[PDB]
Design a protein around this ligand. Structure first.
Ligand SMILES: Nc1ccn([C@@H]2O[C@H](CO)[C@@H](O)[C@H]2OP(=O)(O)OC[C@H]2O[C@@H](n3cnc4c(=O)[nH]c(N)nc43)[C@H](O)[C@@H]2O)c(=O)n1
Length: 105
């Protein structure tokens, strides 16, 4: 919804995210899946430069994507990872939504 919320739930400083610990936070509320992006805010923010408001952008470069997928109720997860391009929704040249992986919707 905003740059601040986007960072909190989609950017990570480590490849080994503690899913069971993170996902229980109110931001995630034990949702089925959440994909993290291993990168600093600057690199991610730059993807939205010169992008029309409320439109998506597909990155040219790849990122490692730590992903938490729920395996057992109510909040138990398995950590999965892969590498791929990311689709972000921009607003005022700032990412506010994680739109897709590999391509845009
Ligand atoms: N909404 C979803 C979520 C997960 N999945 C897939 O279900 C598997 C786990 O059982 C994962 O490996 C996913 O494949 P995937 O290639 O990681 O993701 C496919 C699509 O899912 C959406 N998705 C993934 N992570 C996120 C996330 O954190 N947020 C949002 N909004 N969408 C996400 C994107 O639209 C992406 O292109 C899906 O098809 N749709």
């Amino acid at each position: 919804q905003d740059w601040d919320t986007f960072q909190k739930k989609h950017l990570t400083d480590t490849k080994k995210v503690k899913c069971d610990v993170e996902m229980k936070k109110a931001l995630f509320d034990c949702k089925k899946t959440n994909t993290f992006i291993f990168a600093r805010p600057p690199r991610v923010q730059a993807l939205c430069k010169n992008i029309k408001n409320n439109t998506n952008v597909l990155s040219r470069d790849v990122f490692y994507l730590p992903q938490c997928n729920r395996k057992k109720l109510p909040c138990h997860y398995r950590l999965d990872g892969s590498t791929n391009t990311i689709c972000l929704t921009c607003m005022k040249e700032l990412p506010i939504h994680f739109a897709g992986v590999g391509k845009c919707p």
